[PDB]
Amino acid sequence: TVSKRYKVTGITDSGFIDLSYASAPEAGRSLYRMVCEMVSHIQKESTYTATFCVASARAAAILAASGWLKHKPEDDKYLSQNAYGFLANGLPLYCDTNSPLDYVIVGVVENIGEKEIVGSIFYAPYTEGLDLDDPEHVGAFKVVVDPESLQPSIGL
Amino acid sequence: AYSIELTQDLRAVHGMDADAELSGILATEIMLEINREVVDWINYSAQVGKS
Amino acid sequence: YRVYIDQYAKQDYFTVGYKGPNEMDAGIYYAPYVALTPLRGSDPKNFQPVM
């Protein structure tokens, strides 16, 4: 609901591409052109290098159908285990499997260090001011014990 | 009846303790009223002077 | 005499009282029983505290 829709006159007009199984990876690579172009349309307007990609399962397979998505055993380290693989362009491809689209998003996450952190959808949880057990839990549970039936109720 | 989302705000932004502030104004209010009571049973129960 | 201000007073006045040496000789008895026993809880449906 943020990412600026990428529309080219030839094909993607109407807002998105239509891929058909006819003839070869020629359909599956024809999406890998649109990922590559979206990455260069970040580097024009954003100027950041567009360090990830997100795609629904069915639309990340046809981007895997292109070839040029190489997971492979030795390459595990850089993809942080969440990525479905690396596009040959050097981008991790994060399979979605959730949203109701079949979309392919490109985006950026770059922290140059110190206080400069820039990338889509900044998230940024807030626990500071709360007493937590371990820092990473992002908000604390609470228990109640309803005083009608005494059986507890736990919520975060 | 203070919100659970308040304390976190008020611990973070103001550093004050939330709870311990309400326990501040309730414990003070009752002892102000119980004290405003007896002074108001003295002036209520006192005869009219200079009469 | 020992002059206590009345900080909240509608018109103006002075109420000349009496307090004997005993706690018995007074004219009015303020006898406490329990003192400000705090009570805590939380709203069981929405998890939010009350005190």
UniProtKB/Swiss-Prot annotation, chain A:
Proteolytic cleavage at the N-terminus by the prohead core protein protease gives rise to the mature capsid vertex protein. It comes from the Viruses. Capsid protein that self-associates to form pentons, building the capsid in association with hexamers of the major capsid protein and one dodecamer of the portal protein. The capsid vertex protein self-associates to form 11 pentons, building the T=13 laevo capsid in association with 160 hexamers of the major capsid protein. Homopentamer. Interacts with the portal protein. Interacts with the major capsid protein that forms 160 hexamers. Belongs to the Tevenvirinae capsid vertex family. This is Capsid vertex protein. It comes from Enterobacteria phage T4. The lineage of its organism: Viruses, Duplodnaviria, Heunggongvirae, Uroviricota, Caudoviricetes.
From Swiss-Prot, chain C:
Coiled coil: none annotated. A proteolytic cleavage by the prohead core protein protease gives rise to the mature major capsid protein during virus maturation. Major capsid protein that self-associates to form hexamers, building most of the capsid in association with pentons made of the capsid vertex protein and one dodecamer of the portal protein. The major capsid protein self-associates to form 160 hexamers, building most of the T=13 laevo capsid. Folding of major capsid protein requires the assistance of two chaperones, the host chaperone groL acting with the phage encoded gp23-specific chaperone, gp31. The capsid also contains two nonessential outer capsid proteins, Hoc and Soc, which decorate the capsid surface. Belongs to the Tevenvirinae major capsid protein family. Homohexamer. Interacts with the portal protein. Interacts with the capsid vertex protein that forms pentamers. Interacts with hoc; one hoc molecule associates with each capsid hexamer. Interacts with soc; this interaction reinforces the capsid structure. A total of 960 subunits of the major capsid protein forms the 160 hexamers. This is Major capsid protein. The lineage of its organism: Viruses, Duplodnaviria, Heunggongvirae, Uroviricota, Caudoviricetes. The chain holds residues 421 to 471 of 521 of the full protein.
